[PDB]
Every structure is written in C-alpha cells, then in structure tokens.
Design a protein around this ligand. Structure first.
Ligand SMILES: *[C@@H]1O[C@H](CO)[C@@H](O[C@@H]2O[C@H](CO)[C@@H](O[C@@H]3O[C@H](CO[C@H]4O[C@H](CO)[C@@H](O)[C@H](O)[C@@H]4O)[C@@H](O)[C@H](O[C@H]4O[C@H](CO)[C@@H](O)[C@H](O)[C@@H]4O)[C@@H]3O)[C@H](O)[C@H]2NC(C)=O)[C@H](O)[C@H]1NC(C)=O
Ligand SMILES: *[C@@H]1O[C@H](CO)[C@@H](O[C@@H]2O[C@H](CO)[C@@H](O[C@@H]3O[C@H](CO[C@H]4O[C@H](CO)[C@@H](O)[C@H](O)[C@@H]4O)[C@@H](O)[C@H](O[C@H]4O[C@H](CO)[C@@H](O)[C@H](O)[C@@H]4O)[C@@H]3O)[C@H](O)[C@H]2NC(C)=O)[C@H](O)[C@H]1NC(C)=O
Ligand SMILES: *[C@@H]1O[C@H](CO)[C@@H](O)[C@H](O)[C@H]1NC(C)=O
Lengths: 66, 50
C-alpha cells in the first residue's frame, strides 16, 4: 500500500499494488487484518476519515443509528 | 485454527496462526468458506455463540 504524493495539495489518496507491477487500484477490506499492537510508524487516523481512505469499509452502528 | 486449552475452566478461545510461527490472533470472516456438507469431527455450534 502506498500514497501517491502527500497532503501538500490535499492528495492523500491510497492505492495498493504488487511489488513488480504498477497497477494502482482501490484497496479492499478483505485484504487487511486487525492487530492489537501499534507502532510509531503507523498513521493515527480516526473513524470519520476511515471512509475517505477506504470507502469499502462500513460501520454498522453509524448506519443503524442514522 | 486452534483452541487454547478447553472449556474445563471456560477457556473456549479460538485463535488462528501459521503452521511454523506461533502468532495467536483473532480470526477474520474473509478467511473462512461455507460448505454444504458436514462431518462428525466438526463442532455443532449455534447462532447465539457465533
Ligand atoms: C500517532 O499518534 C501516536 C500516539 O502519540 C504516535 O505514537 C507515539 O506515541 C508515543 C507515546 O504516546 C509518543 O511519545 C513518545 O514515546 C516514545 C516511547 O515511549 C517512551 O516514553 C518515555 C519518554 O521518552 C520513556 O521514558 C519510556 O521508557 C517510553 O519508552 C519516546 O521515544 C518519545 O520520546 C521522545 O520525546 C522525548 C521528549 O518528550 C525525548 O526525551 C526522547 O528522546 C524522544 O525524542 C515520545 O515520548 C510519541 O511521540 C508518538 N509518536 C510520534 C511520532 O509522535 C504515532 O507515532 C503517531 N503517528 C504518526 C504518523 O504521527
Ligand atoms: C454435532 O452434532 C452432530 C449431529 O448429531 C454430530 O454428528 C453425528 O451425527 C450422527 C447422525 O445424527 C449421529 O449419529 C451417528 O451416526 C453415525 C453414522 O450414521 C449411521 O447411522 C446408523 C446407525 O449407526 C447406520 O445404520 C447408518 O447406516 C448411518 O451410517 C453412526 O456411526 C453412529 O452410530 C454409533 O452409535 C450406534 C448406536 O446408536 C452404534 O450402534 C454404532 O456402532 C456407533 O457407535 C451414530 O448413530 C452421531 O452421533 C453424531 N456424532 C456424534 C459425535 O455424536 C457431530 O459429531 C456433533 N459434533 C460434536 C463435536 O459433537
Ligand atoms: C457505535 O455502536 C454503539 C453500540 O455498541 C453505540 O452505542 C454507538 O452510539 C455507536 N456509535 C456510532 C458513532 O455509531
């Protein structure tokens, strides 16, 4: 997973590709796993920005409540 | 997928790991598949305990 450029001009778009082929494509929820431990190098995002980075992710309570 | 110990003291916790590395981690839905046939060796659970 990489980010094309940076937020310098609001371009925090995330794409996933192989290590030999350059095929920028939207990530999928099934392609990740959840870990209980975190490191300094990982970006500390929030729930509101979760749909922005990954629109495929869905929150059950956010939809059911409203 | 393995279960650490048994229900002898209510420890029916399930973890998944590789066959060489010991990394007990919570399983994910996408890692499993659905089959129409069942065997004797499979535990007969229910929806509440899912
Ligand atoms: C997203 O947000 C998280 C949360 O802030 C960032 O993760 C880091 O989280 C830690 C803990 O809150 C932040 O604090 C740093 O802790 C490091 C390790 O903890 C030590 O803390 C004390 C003091 O160092 C030690 O005595 C103790 O034994 C622990 O080992 C420290 O290495 C850092 O110390 C730095 O600053 C102090 C001054 O406060 C200096 O004296 C040190 O030499 C050193 O320079 C610090 O205390 C840490 O700041 C968070 N990281 C960052 C980068 O801010 C994620 O990193 C963040 N993600 C992104 C992408 O920003
Ligand atoms: C979770 O729950 C399920 C459902 O009970 C368990 O799966 C097994 O399901 C079968 C069917 O309901 C249970 O019954 C056993 O059937 C076996 C095969 O079926 C044969 O049934 C008759 C009688 O044997 C045969 O004539 C016919 O041709 C079928 O081939 C049998 O092998 C078993 O027979 C045992 O008991 C009889 C006495 O009733 C003896 O005569 C036999 O020699 C033999 O000892 C039985 O009839 C079966 O009990 C269920 N298994 C278990 C372990 O209970 C899952 O196994 C269960 N999961 C867990 C983890 O418990
Ligand atoms: C998240 O779900 C909990 C129920 O476990 C609910 O109380 C809470 O309000 C929900 N939050 C949002 C933002 O949907």
């Amino acid at each position: 997973l990489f980010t094309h450029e940076l937020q310098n001009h609001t371009a925090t778009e995330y794409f996933v590709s192989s290590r030999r082929m350059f095929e920028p494509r939207k990530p999928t929820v099934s392609d990740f796993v959840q870990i209980e431990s975190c490191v300094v190098t990982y970006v500390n995002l929030t729930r509101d920005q979760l749909p922005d980075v990954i629109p495929d992710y869905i929150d059950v309570n956010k939809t059911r409540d409203e």
